[PDB]
Design a protein around this ligand. Structure first.
Ligand SMILES: CC(C)CCC[C@@H](C)[C@H]1CC[C@H]2[C@@H]3CC=C4C[C@@H](O)CC[C@]4(C)[C@H]3CC[C@]12C
Ligand SMILES: CC(C)CCC[C@@H](C)[C@H]1CC[C@H]2[C@@H]3CC=C4C[C@@H](O)CC[C@]4(C)[C@H]3CC[C@]12C
Ligand SMILES: O=C(O)c1ccccc1O
Ligand SMILES: O=C(O)c1ccccc1O
Lengths: 680, 680
């Protein structure tokens, strides 16, 4: 075995520097640092193509034997869920339902070619649908008259067409913004989305969607509220109008809701019994449409249905740029929110399955998908939380599962779009509510974060409140800023400790922690685990004067008190010897007689101009009353900050630095002993 | 002499903890922590009275012999400057000039009793006057007709009265806000005003005031612009209308401007020749009014003058609360800006003269001053930069200098208010411009901050730009947020270093720095001088895998490449031994053969849940390829973060911690030697 044993002279700063000679670095010209980027070797261009076109990467290396069954089952199980969710989100956007299926096919196909993550199901999203519907209603209210040959029997088809055009324009603008952000390498901002913030934002969005689904379930009409305090206004509106509900719609919605809970719990408790989970949503919609067609609930009890569904695909429609100046803000908000949600899901799924995703490629893929979708009659979309988990939980392994879902959505569009025209809105509302239960389950993080780390609990609660009451567009920004400022709070509330020396060793630990550490007499040690930047210097000085019990101001006051009570280019020395008579010392109230204060800088990352000024003031003031101050553990970075500022214009301040606490202790003790020698 | 010498066993975590026994703390009940606050000893109540009423402190201890002359000279020299500045700021607020003298007397008298700082000259401020004028014009335009018995010969007196009432209401609201903030102990926020931010904000405000003074100097009329892009719009407006200037007003303004520069430079170069500096502003206004009265410039050349000045004080006027819902935002902005500026000046003057100021008492004093001034026909004010520098520079020592200035302003109000009625606006504009030169001089910080610290230069430029183009109300908030986020940027761009061991000692320094440090073979050391919070873990992992040249992913890839090329409750061990055949090692491209990676945690202040997850992933992944990872310098705080999270559910991870880099090196070397022993 071996024991920790080192023998060496006391390493102050000048003693250590005379033993070290700076190395000569190799400068890299900014001109020669650009030439090597244009070698254009086949490997480099192949890597670039692989980066921009991930389909060329994971498709040739497709391991058939263990991917075919999982991909097929996951694709079927996610398409059967994407259909009712697509229709439901279409109605939330104040657009005809067929546009939900239009928006659930083109971007999925494009993301199967341009996407990096291989476990997310891109498609219609509830939050994006809500925001698109809000802007569509804001631009096009229910009071627009068009004399385009239509008689007095207006079916509001013109209003729906204008709303569709508004959604297309804002989607195209959001896609262009996302593409421009992606090519600008901005996707590096996704790292600021901490896990508690994402969980809180998703839960708040889940509450918004759940409360926005109540009017669809009950069947009562209610004007849509968008903006600040939207959730509370919407819920009080639906509560005021609840007296005029539709009994049959509520009954069928509650029945399918209970059936969905029963089936989901059955699958959960019979997980081992199944080779592949049964698609419950498909059975739910089949039952709903069968009953509705059986009893003709559209008119017999005034139970509104999804409506007619035209067939056939549409040729590309070149949009107009006449609405950009009206919806430019909301398009930016849509792009930011969609990218944030999709990057959070892609990152967490990649971490779970052991790989990596690219933020910039995600932005580029979303931008191209949204833009070309706007050319192809499609509104803005992003990743979907519940749908992606359903696709993965059933054995999703590559992105071909999304392609299969897109293909079956195409099949429904072309062939059996008429079959679902009688589906009541209650079934879709209950399906959305039941699939959103997984997001209600995230309240378990409240006691958990309370036990583990209260700062993250504060971030979670602040994000949830800011995204619930205020609009989702600005709640995310507010939560991000609060999360960033929590670091500032942490650096403004550090742990000031006074250290003591373990006997016979060099381990220095807090004096009030372990009952065996003993403070060295005449030497006080202070430690701060935080930088000394502008918003921290004053607190550091106050803590130094309070914890150590050595305040030069009160020392001078007591010295003058004893004085009045008894009576009835070169630089000056940093430490002024105590010009206090020994006879006057008899009238000097007792004290610890501290002769040196050691400052620990091992846990100080940086110091700025305000910090340097405060440190110089501390050194000068403490030296005024004849108390030496040494800095221990000054890293090379902090030494550079001190040198850059005006701290070291007096060369005699070089010797105050040291390398370790024990080095400073040995130096101070040796200096005291040397001063003892010449005393007598 | 003594040499650094320590002999001790290797201190891992369990070895150190078995030698330490936790002390028992003394709990302080939240109930008994409140009882001692109500002792109500005479000393405590005396201290409270001293805190709330600083006049009771520095007045009884007034040292006459060295304060009388300095206070008198400073008070005279600051009153003679406060008068023209008060009149000039009155006209900038779109109120009759007499209200400038009303606002220059009451709050100065009150701050002489309720103020803490003893070197600032409270009074009218250019920025506050500009904002008050902006809100007054916004509420009361030039198109208001009142049929209150006034004939068609309307002198716009009603419009001026409404503007005065608006200013009074907003001033009272701002005063109430300041008082409520002060009693709430909110004045603790003043620490976020770093020096570069304050300097940049003051320079931007100086530019705003200078460009707002051009129309007064030239004599041309120009409608006032308030809000975003106010400076550029105002300067292009005054440039477009310059063709209709008044020659005589410009001539007298330039003459007094040149005289002021000449006299100021004369005082600067004859500083030693004077016992007390001559008041140049008084001579300037005397000359201007003498010439204007001599030639009657009010009508002879259409040179506008300050106008008539009514005498006599006014009885208190109880305001109205009918304008709060219109000006509540601007009152809040006024309060914040005024408190920020005054606290910056008070803090810097206290630091210069060696004492301290209280932010909360400053807020309380400003709130009471503004409120009771609004009762006494006075608009909102705060500290004045140039006036305070003039007061302190001539020998201002206590707050009685402000009282003398208030008394002489009262003398002018009561007796000689008519004498200054013919003073041209050109003289006042040139006086404001010449006294604001000291704020133009602050561009010298650009090369200075460029040389010292580029981050503070970025803060300075961002503050200047955000406060120049955008309005001063929101530029301050934007600059504060940017300054706070610079810390986040600093923690996101740390300095990753790979350390080496100085021979025969225990000093570990960067391997690419000093040419004598030598890396220990088989051991790689990594150090980060930043926390490991959520927005930093990914960069830390990438830097660890790049700098040290030990990437487990590429190691596994190379191992599998050699493999395919050659062929033609208990827990598992953390480190899995390399199941790689020695024959396959012959096909394994050469490497450094690193057997242990040491992570330096001496400069890590805190770690959060994301950081803990990343650290656990690093440990597991590095142990997968048979590479031990040790943590060195884990402080008790970081150990607490790791324990609170789920890092230590496997007790075998306790031994991975250590106390110092050399301890970890010795432990790893000893473990390798022990593994060597049983090999053969
Ligand atoms: C620490 C953080 C929160 C500081 C910055 C907060 C900013 C981004 C917040 C605080 C107050 C917010 C505003 C509050 C209310 C509204 C009205 C609403 O109809 C549109 C958004 C808007 C205008 C918000 C925009 C974002 C906002 C200005
Ligand atoms: C945290 C970092 C990004 C700084 C944030 C600065 C925020 C709070 C600033 C910057 C730009 C500001 C906006 C600029 C202009 C206007 C128009 C005005 O009629 C009302 C206030 C309003 C809407 C401001 C609100 C506050 C604002 C949004
Ligand atoms: O339906 C979803 O998948 C969903 C996901 C997140 C938030 C609200 C939602 O409705
Ligand atoms: O007159 C001043 O002292 C002053 C100070 C700061 C900004 C504008 C100003 O006019």
């Amino acid at each position: 075995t071996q024991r920790y044993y080192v023998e060496r002279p006391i390493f102050s700063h000048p003693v250590l520097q005379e033993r070290l000679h700076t190395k000569d670095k190799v400068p890299d010209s900014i001109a020669d640092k650009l030439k090597q980027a244009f070698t254009c070797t086949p490997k480099k261009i192949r890597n670039i193509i692989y980066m921009f076109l991930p389909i060329t990467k994971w498709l040739p290396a497709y391991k058939f034997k263990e991917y075919v069954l999982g991909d097929l089952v996951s694709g079927i199980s996610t398409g059967v869920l994407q259909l009712p969710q697509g229709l439901a989100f279409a109605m939330l956007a104040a657009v005809p339902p067929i546009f939900g299926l239009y928006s659930s096919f083109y971007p999925v196909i494009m993301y199967c070619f341009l996407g990096t993550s291989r476990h997310i199901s891109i498609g219609p999203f509830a939050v994006i649908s809500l925001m698109i519907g809000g802007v569509a209603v804001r631009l096009v209210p229910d009071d627009i008259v068009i004399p385009g040959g239509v008689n007095a029997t207006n079916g509001t088809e013109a209003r729906d067409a204008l709303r569709v055009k508004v959604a297309m324009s804002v989607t195209l603008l959001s896609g262009i913004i996302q593409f421009c952000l992606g090519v600008c390498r901005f996707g590096f901002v996704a790292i600021y989305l901490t896990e508690p913030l994402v969980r809180g934002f998703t839960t708040a969005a889940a509450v918004h969607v759940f409360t926005s689904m109540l009017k669809y379930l009950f069947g009562v009409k209610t004007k849509r509220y968008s903006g600040i305090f939207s959730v509370v206004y919407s819920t009080v509106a639906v509560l005021q109008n609840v007296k005029n509900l539709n009994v049959c719609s509520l009954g069928v919605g509650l029945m399918v809701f209970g059936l969905l809970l029963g089936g989901k719990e059955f699958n959960e408790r019979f997980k081992e019994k199944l080779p592949a989970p049964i698609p419950l949503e498909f059975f739910a919609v089949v039952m709903g449409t069968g009953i509705s067609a059986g009893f003709n609930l559209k008119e017999s009890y005034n139970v509104d249905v999804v409506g007619t569904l035209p067939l056939g695909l549409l040729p590309p429609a070149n949009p107009d740029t006449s609405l950009f100046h009206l919806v430019y803000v909301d398009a930016i908000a849509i792009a930011i929110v969609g990218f944030s949600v999709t990057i959070s899901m892609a990152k967490t799924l990649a971490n779970k399955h052991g790989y990596q995703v690219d933020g910039n490629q995600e932005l580029i893929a979303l931008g191209l998908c949204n833009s070309i979708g706007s050319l192809f009659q499609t509104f803005s979309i992003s990743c979907s939380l519940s749908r992606s988990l359903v696709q993965e939980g059933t054995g999703g392994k590559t992105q071909l599962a999304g392609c299969l879902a897109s293909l079956m959505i195409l099949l429904v569009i072309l062939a059996t779009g008429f079959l679902f025209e009688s589906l009541p809105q209650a079934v879709l509302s209950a399906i959305v509510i039941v699939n959103l239960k997984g997001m209600f389950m995230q309240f378990s993080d409240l006691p958990f974060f309370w036990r583990t780390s209260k700062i993250e609990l504060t971030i979670w609660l602040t994000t949830f409140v800011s995204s619930l009451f205020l609009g989702l567009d600005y709640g995310l920004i507010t939560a991000v800023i609060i999360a960033l400022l929590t670091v500032i709070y942490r650096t403004q509330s550090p742990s000031y400790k006074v250290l003591g020396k373990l006997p016979e060793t060099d381990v220095y630990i807090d004096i009030d922690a372990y009952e065996e550490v003993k403070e060295i007499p005449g030497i006080k040690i202070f430690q701060i685990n935080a930088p000394i930047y502008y918003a921290n210097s004053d607190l550091y000085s106050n803590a130094l004067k309070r914890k150590t019990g050595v305040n030069p101001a009160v020392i001078m006051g007591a010295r003058r008190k004893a004085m009045r009570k008894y009576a009835k280019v070169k630089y000056p020395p940093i430490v002024i010897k105590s010009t206090f008579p020994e006879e006057m010392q008899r009238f000097m109230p007792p004290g610890d007689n501290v002769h040196t204060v050691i400052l620990d800088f091992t846990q100080v990352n940086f110091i700025d101009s305000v910090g340097v000024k405060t440190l110089a003031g501390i050194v000068k003031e403490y030296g005024d009353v004849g108390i030496y101050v040494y800095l221990a553990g000054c890293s090379a970075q902090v030494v550079n900050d001190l040198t850059r500022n005006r701290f070291f214009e007096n060369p005699a301040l070089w010797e105050l630095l040291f390398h370790s606490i024990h080095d400073a202790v040995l130096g101070s003790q040796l200096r005291e002993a040397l001063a003892e020698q010449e005393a007598s």
